[PDB]
């Protein structure tokens, strides 16, 4: 809801904190994409909510190993147990991280570019299995990640521009980076 949107933004900011961290050891790490931001792009025609951040990103190996493990461990039974009982929360106490995305979306794509690798696309349909492929279809990003949620039919309110603007309006004081919204 509004809390979920807020959590997604706070979650995106972690990737920005991490690239800034690497930056303390090697300034070059930040230089590939000096613009630090969080940008939300509703795409109602596709029933897709997109959140991009210019954080540290993930390499192919990190996509397969980390997200691959999340998808594999996220069996139909597990998600079922998660569904109802605790509802949501991605971050904070009683947060379930990436799994909560599967509660709002049936398909999830993670486009990612790390300074140490090329641009790739990770994807999974309600967990179970996942894929990773070299990106030859989306926009090229300097660094970071585009998390693309294909919203479930009963959760389309996440595409509402007015709702999103009110969220970023009162949450941009809890995040150290600008939160931008793409208005279509």
Task: Give all domains of the chain, ordered by start, each with its CATH number.
Answer: 1-184 (3.30.565.10)
How far is C-alpha 10 from the geometric centre of its chain's CA atoms?
10
**CA-based nearest residue to 121, from 25, 113, 155, 34:** 113
Is residue 110 a contact partner of residue 67, using CB atoms and an 8 Å limit? yes
- The residues, ordered by sequence, that sit 6+ positions from 119 with a Cβ below 8 Å of its Cβ are 111, 112, 113, 134, 135, 138, 140, 141
Sign of torsion over alpha carbons 33, 49, 118, 98:
positive
The DSSP code sequence of 45-56 is TTTEEEEEE-S-
Cβ contact 39:82 at 8 Å: no
Question: Which pairing describes strands 179-181 and 38-43: parallel, antiparallel, or unpaired?
Answer: parallel
Please tell me whether 97 is known to bind a ligand.
Answer: yes
Q: Is 45 known to sit in a ligand binding site?
A: no
Residues in the chain: 184
Resolution attained, angstroms = 1.9
Q: Is 75 flagged in the annotation as binding?
A: no
Does an H or E element contain 21, and which? Answer: helix 2-25
CA dist 38 to 69, 103, 146, Å?
A: 26, 22, 10
90 belongs to an annotated ligand binding site: no
Ligand-binding annotation for 157, yes or no, is: no
Q: In which residue are the tokens 């190996």 written?
A: 61
The answer to whether the annotation marks 11 as part of a ligand binding site is yes
Nearest CA among 141, 146, 75, 155 for reference residue 110: 146
H/E stretch holding 168 reads helix 161-171
Sign of CA dihedral 154, 150, 175, 38: negative
Strand order in the sheet with 120-125: 131-134, 120-125, 105-113, 144-151, 48-53, 38-43, 179-181
Which method was it determined by? Answer: X-ray
Give me 162's structure tokens: 């007015």
Say if residue 109 carries a ligand binding annotation.
no
7 annotated to a ligand binding site: yes
Is position 137 annotated in a ligand binding site?
no
């Amino acid at each position: 809801k509004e809390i979920f949107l807020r959590e997604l933004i706070s979650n995106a900011s972690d990737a920005l904190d991490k690239i800034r961290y690497k930056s303390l050891s090697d300034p070059k790490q930040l230089e590939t994409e000096p613009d630090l931001f969080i940008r939300i792009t509703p795409k109602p025609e596709q029933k897709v909510l997109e959140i991009r951040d210019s954080g540290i990103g993930m390499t192919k190996a990190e996509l397969i190993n980390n997200l691959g493990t999340i998808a594999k461990s996220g069996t139909k039974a597990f998600m079922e147990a998660l569904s109802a009982g605790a509802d949501v929360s991605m971050i904070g106490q009683f947060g379930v991280g990436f799994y909560s995305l599967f509660l709002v979306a049936d398909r999830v794509q993670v486009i990612s570019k790390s300074n140490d690798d090329e641009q790739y696309i990770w994807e999974s349909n309600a967990g179970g299995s996942f894929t990773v492929t070299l990106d030859e279809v989306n926009e090229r990003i300097g660094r970071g990640t585009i998390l693309r949620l294909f919203l479930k039919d009963d959760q389309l309110e996440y595409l509402e521009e007015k709702r999103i603007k009110e969220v970023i309006k009162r949450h941009s004081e809890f995040v150290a980076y600008p939160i931008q919204l793409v208005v279509t």
